[PDB]
Amino acid sequence: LKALDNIVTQFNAYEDFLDSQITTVDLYYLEDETLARQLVELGYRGTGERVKREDFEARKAAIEIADNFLTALAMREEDNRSGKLSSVIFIRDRNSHGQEISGYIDYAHRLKTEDFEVYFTGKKRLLPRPTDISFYNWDADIAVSNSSPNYQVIADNPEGLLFRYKRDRKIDNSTRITILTELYVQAVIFDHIS
């Protein structure tokens, strides 16, 4: 991926890249240049790297680019954007298959990864994920742990959980709020103030 993006950045167009792969013998055989480029698609008749022309347009475009529960998450999101809070979520619910699910979700890291206005409007649901920092399906009985930079799973502890955030090494000012929800069976919010 890095090599294809490198060639995308090297040549102003794959027009020019496939023109470079076009030798003069195709030029005085075909007597055309765009038709020669469409011939020099792939190594089919050239030394062109496996990047489609439309894929080049997409890749250079990508380089150029580069319920009280919803209200509670709204204030938590505004505090997260202010940057004086790191927050996590306890979810108890059932999935589409119906198994009972308990999740410990990195709310601020999930906010940074994807936008949550869809979650506030209800088109998407905050569900326990293996990519989340702790995941536990009660019928599956598998505990999945993630080492997010927002919250770190410990190597070992006997007594209680210790989740660490990199700036404050708190493995400090944690407020606990449990709220009744309609879609979810139980929802708890843990707020660690920065």
Partner 1 sequence: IANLKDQLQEMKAKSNLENRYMKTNTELQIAQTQKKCNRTEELLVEEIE
Partner 2 sequence: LIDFEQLKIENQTFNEKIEERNEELLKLRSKVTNSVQVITHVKEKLHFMDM
Residues that bind partner 2 (CB under 8 A): 90, 92, 102, 104, 134, 136, 143, 145, 153-161, 178, 186, 188
**Min. distance of Cβ 90 from partner 2 in angstroms?**
6
Which CB sits closer to partner 1, 45 or 92? 45
By a kind-dependent CB cut-off of 5 to 8 A, residue 38 interacts, out of partner 2, partner 1, none, with none
Nearest to 7 by CA among 65, 38, 45, 52: 52
Which CB sits closer to partner 2, 121 or 178? 178
Tell me the C-alpha distance between 19 and 96, whole Å: 53
**Min. distance of Cβ 89 from partner 2 in angstroms?**
12
What does the binding site for partner 1 look like in residue numbers (CB under 8 A)? 27-28, 31-33
**Min. distance of Cβ 29 from partner 1 in angstroms?**
12
CA-to-CA separations, 127 to 47, 85, 141, 175, in angstroms, rounded: 47, 21, 17, 22
CA 180 vs. chain centroid, Å, equals 29
By a kind-dependent CB cut-off of 5 to 8 A, residue 186 interacts, out of partner 2, partner 1, none, with partner 2
Helix, strand, coil shares of the chain, percent, nearest 5, are 40, 20, 40
Amino acid identity at 57: E
Tell me the C-alpha distance between 188 and 178, whole Å: 4
By a kind-dependent CB cut-off of 5 to 8 A, residue 178 interacts, out of partner 2, partner 1, none, with partner 2
